[PDB]
């Protein structure tokens, strides 16, 4: 499945319809899960040689590069030029402090060879996923430039794969666009909501801004259905309007010394306010003092 998709992506990139981009996106989404499973297996296999390597490297690619650069030998963390290009200086210092006191035995030769093969397979899967994402971005820029510039190239490719192209997506209304590929399962979890354009928003204003993100992208489906808007100025204007709306959603005179003129109205016209808002209190048993006796204690207050 992955080899035929890679051959189709190579044949598409060497020659430079719409289902090939969706197939490449599905192959990249499968290869990402395969690389995540390979990174989990490499972290479970290399846990004896470096048990603090998973805590020091939370990323899967960073942990794979650390397992490929250091491996069972913990002496590859002192002034290592290969580990300095993957992680930062503080991360390299934390990895050196973890490898100074690791309290773990080194792995065997077959386990290290299997870990190196899993790291090479994860690197090849990540490279194939990056090539498939680049091919999908090129096909989206050649097919739907406004939809790739407004909501993203991968989101436009997923919308064209789910709806059936730009010709079927143009028919889709804002409600369908808002819940494009939408559904505990989140109601109205549209692809726009599950996208990079909706990820740069607070969760309290993530869905409704997705209503500003999907339906305008539906206008991009009306923009890429014909042969017009090949540059992407409408998608850039929609993205600028969405950014202005997200910036707006996120973050003295003195009255004259005059009073009322006179009182002439009262009863079912001004009495309602004086009975509800300025409601009549007890007006008794709370204003009397009983100057002769003393009800409360001497210092109850």
């Amino acid at each position: 499945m992955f080899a035929e998709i890679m051959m189709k992506i190579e044949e598409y990139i060497s020659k430079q319809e719409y289902r090939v981009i969706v197939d490449a996106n599905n192959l990249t989404v499968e290869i990402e899960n395969e690389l995540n499973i390979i990174h989990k297996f490499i972290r479970d296999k290399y846990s004896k040689r470096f048990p603090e390597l998973e805590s020091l490297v939370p990323n899967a690619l960073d942990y794979i590069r650390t397992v490929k650069e250091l491996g069972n030998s913990l002496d590859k963390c002192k002034n290592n030029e290969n580990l300095q290009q993957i992680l930062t200086n503080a991360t390299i210092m934390v990895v050196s402090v973890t490898a100074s006191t690791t309290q773990g035995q080194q792995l065997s030769e077959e386990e290290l060879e299997r870990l190196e093969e899993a790291c090479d397979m994860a690197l090849e899967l990540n490279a194939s996923k990056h090539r498939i994402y680049e091919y999908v971005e090129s096909r989206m820029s050649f097919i739907a430039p406004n939809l790739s510039i407004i909501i993203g190239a991968s989101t436009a490719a997923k919308i064209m794969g789910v709806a059936g192209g730009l010709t079927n997506l143009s028919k889709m209304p804002a409600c369908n666009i808002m819940l494009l590929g939408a559904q505990s399962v989140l109601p109205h979890t549209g692809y726009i909501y599950h996208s990079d354009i909706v990820q740069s928003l607070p969760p309290d204003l993530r869905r409704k801004a997705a209503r500003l993100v999907a339906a305008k992208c539906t206008l991009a489906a009306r923009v890429d259905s014909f042969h017009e808007s090949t540059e992407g100025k409408v998608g850039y204007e929609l993205k600028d309007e969405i950014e202005r709306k997200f910036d707006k959603w996120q973050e003295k005179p003195l009255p004259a010394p005059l009073d009322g003129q006179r009182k002439k109205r009262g009863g079912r016209r001004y009495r309602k306010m004086k009975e509800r808002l300025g409601l009549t209190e007890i007006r008794k048993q709370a204003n009397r003092m009983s100057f002769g006796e003393i009800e409360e204690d001497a210092y109850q207050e």
Binding site: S170, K171, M172, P173, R222, S229
Partner: protein
């Protein structure tokens, strides 16, 4: 006007279409908005679908005659949404005002007459 907006009605035809749209929206038989018109065309309950030629861009209503080619409904494009600028209380000019059949409509036959008049403009 826009060349892609087809068909184009006359002045009295647009006045009668605006009167029928106001009579449908005042009797709860008209839906404004592009997504509401698309939902009324996909549901198969919309008697007529009207568009606006003064739309920027005009491609957003371009699926409104094509859905009219998918449900056998008459299509028409007001020169400007301004005709329905107030529409059913809409402050902004209205474009997609899917007029859906209303049970015992006080102007049901009048709406049918508008349909018959909108089917002869596209020739």
């Amino acid at each position: 006007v826009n060349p892609k907006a087809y068909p184009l009605a006359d002045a009295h035809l647009t006045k009668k279409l605006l009167d029928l749209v106001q009579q449908s929206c005042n009797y709860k038989q008209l839906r404004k908005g592009a997504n509401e018109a698309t939902k009324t065309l996909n549901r198969g309950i919309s008697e007529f679908i009207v568009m606006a030629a003064d739309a920027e861009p005009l491609e957003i209503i371009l699926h409104l005659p094509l859905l009219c080619e998918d449900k056998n409904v008459p299509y028409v494009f007001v020169r400007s949404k301004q005709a329905l600028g107030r529409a059913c209380g809409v402050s902004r000019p209205v474009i997609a005002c899917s007029v859906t059949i209303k049970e015992g409509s006080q102007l049901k036959q009048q709406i049918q007459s508008i349909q018959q008049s909108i089917e002869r403009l596209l020739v």
